[PDB]
Amino acid sequence: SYYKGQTALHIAIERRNMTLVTLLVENGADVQAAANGDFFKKTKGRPGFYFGELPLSLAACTNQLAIVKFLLQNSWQPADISARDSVGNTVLHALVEVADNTVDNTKFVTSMYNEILILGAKLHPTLKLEEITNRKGLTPLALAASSGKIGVLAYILQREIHEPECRHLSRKFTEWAYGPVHSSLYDLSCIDTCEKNSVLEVIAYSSSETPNRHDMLLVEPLNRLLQDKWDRFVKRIFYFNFFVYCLYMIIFTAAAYYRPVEGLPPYKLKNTVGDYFRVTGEILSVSGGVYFFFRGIQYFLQRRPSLKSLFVDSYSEILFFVQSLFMLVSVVLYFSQRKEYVASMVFSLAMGWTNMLYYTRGFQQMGIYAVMIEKMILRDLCRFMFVYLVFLFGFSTAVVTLIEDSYNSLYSTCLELFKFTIGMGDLEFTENYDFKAVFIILLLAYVILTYILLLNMLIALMGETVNKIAQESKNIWKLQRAITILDTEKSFLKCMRKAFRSGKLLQVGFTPDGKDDYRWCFRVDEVNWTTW
Amino acid sequence: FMFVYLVFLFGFSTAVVTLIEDSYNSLYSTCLELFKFTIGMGDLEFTENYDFKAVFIILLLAYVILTYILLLNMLIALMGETVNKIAQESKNIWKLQRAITILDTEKSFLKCMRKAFRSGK
Amino acid sequence: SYYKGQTALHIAIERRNMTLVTLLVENGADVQAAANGDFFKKTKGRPGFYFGELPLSLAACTNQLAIVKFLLQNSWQPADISARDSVGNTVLHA
């Protein structure tokens, strides 16, 4: 369990003993066998350090490049690089999981990663090690993208090896240096329409736990790729969707405004042009409601977000789904001869208009207002509700109790006190209650405590949030644009087929196996003239 | 911010007018009353006995909390940011404005340019 | 169009080859002629780097002062400083 498979070779490794590892692997110890334990497993419930399961993986993670280079080439018992553990981390994946974005750690892990890839290329030209998906089903590229490791991902995105024998693994090819512009040719390997965990998907679909999601899309290839996707086809599809939604909301508003007032539903169709227009508008409205219901169900089934992180990452989808629910309840009440249907429909009307702020996320300068509204409704107001309600209820019950012998009921007292809290009430002291002085004291304390002291506290916190997320306009709207691009591409399969997302699918080299490979790529010209 | 506010105003105005068709009589007056709410200048009464009174109260309270407490203060925070940003750079701003007015004054009256003696010698 | 007027003298320039420019301008290449292309023009719709049109302008913009000093004084074919391109940038303007 704890000490399952661990031997003196690991202890020599972690202590940096050059000769002990050589002696042990000369003795014939089977480095294929893996050591696992509670301390090794990535469990928060127990203390431990994760270094994979393969002993070669531990040697690599523990900063020993010559030692692992010998282990691999040790004729007595070479270690297999392609070993995949039950936990689901390969040696390369183990290195990815070790990294913590630090500059020195970035340099260390990148150097050892490049060295180990070169060694593997020397070892097994026939096999490509990178693409083998690990136990969880995501390759080291996808794992680095999803986990948050910007340092490990940046190099892999612009992984260029100047050795002419390693050109079949380099990701970035420098086409020429005609000037400060340096033409590029990335591999776009499994970035778009590839597999379960594409790089863009894991970057964007992530549950926001990752700590540097915004900075990931600043890498050299991702920015150009997303901008190309936006300009090519996505932009006009989004604008068409916005226009169709505006028409839908206008039709819904016109249909609901001119609803019949005499009788109970359903309402018999009368022979008039206006009646035909009204009924067709109602049919279109209900059709849109059904569409949004099904799109919400499809989204929730696809992503299946966790209950805790449901609202944080799916605010707009939640709101569209709730609007669809309201309209469906309205139609259900319509055919049950209940006049209450209207009361539901208006909630789907008022809501339907405000949901249009979703589309402001498709513009740069106007896109932050939706973000601010979402954050100020989920973070500040939500948890200030609890702080306010103890005050409201305490003083409401106290006032009602004091004068039992507009403040007659508990509902009206709560409403009047809430009006006081927003500076919208009248202090009169006109009626001759019992204990008038105590009533005046209670109301003045409430007004000073909630109107002057708590309301302004809430406003200060809201201003802090607005201030904080108003600096980061570029990052915020870039991420929102990326998410909408992903959703637009994924919604219409024919759209993905006709996207021409990649620049081209050309074979720009010959593999050491002897067969030239056709790889996807796109141009990325970057200007750097100061460095000459 | 006009665009962000008008969706709220129109959505809740149309909703309120639709809800009680059977001061909130017309669409113009409903829009005006809701705008007055947005600037803390309206009266919550709930005195007339409408249909669906609870839903009407819920709609108005949501509107007041969303626009008077949440959007208006957002606008005020952004305005304060702008004021703060262009209140540090007093010297540069007024220097540029003085330069522009000098140019326009010199260019307006040709005799003024002739008699300017702009150059030292 | 793209490769209109560009010759090996420019390629020696941008790579910082001291001797290649001397050889080319000893060969009698007419440095009066200007090279223009889509990459050279200051167009946002296309990628490119602007360095004027005159080859001397490119030599100057590409950080080569002794080389241009010789081009100007090269008795075989001195470059004219006062050359004005159709785009509208002089060497100084470049």
Ligand SMILES: C=C(C)[C@]12C[C@@H](C)[C@@]34O[C@](Cc5ccccc5)(O[C@@H]1[C@@H]3C=C(COC(=O)Cc1ccc(O)c(OC)c1)C[C@]1(O)C(=O)C(C)=C[C@@H]41)O2
């Ligand atoms: C998150 C949820 C469920 C929510 C659903 C409704 C009831 C909502 O009240 C809240 C709670 C609330 C109530 C009153 C004041 C503030 C907040 O906030 C929103 C929700 C809060 C909004 C605010 O409008 C928006 O957020 C638009 C919007 C912003 C950003 C988006 O990404 C977006 O995509 C859809 C939409 C308006 C209402 O949806 C609306 O139109 C009505 C009548 C009630 C508002 O519950």
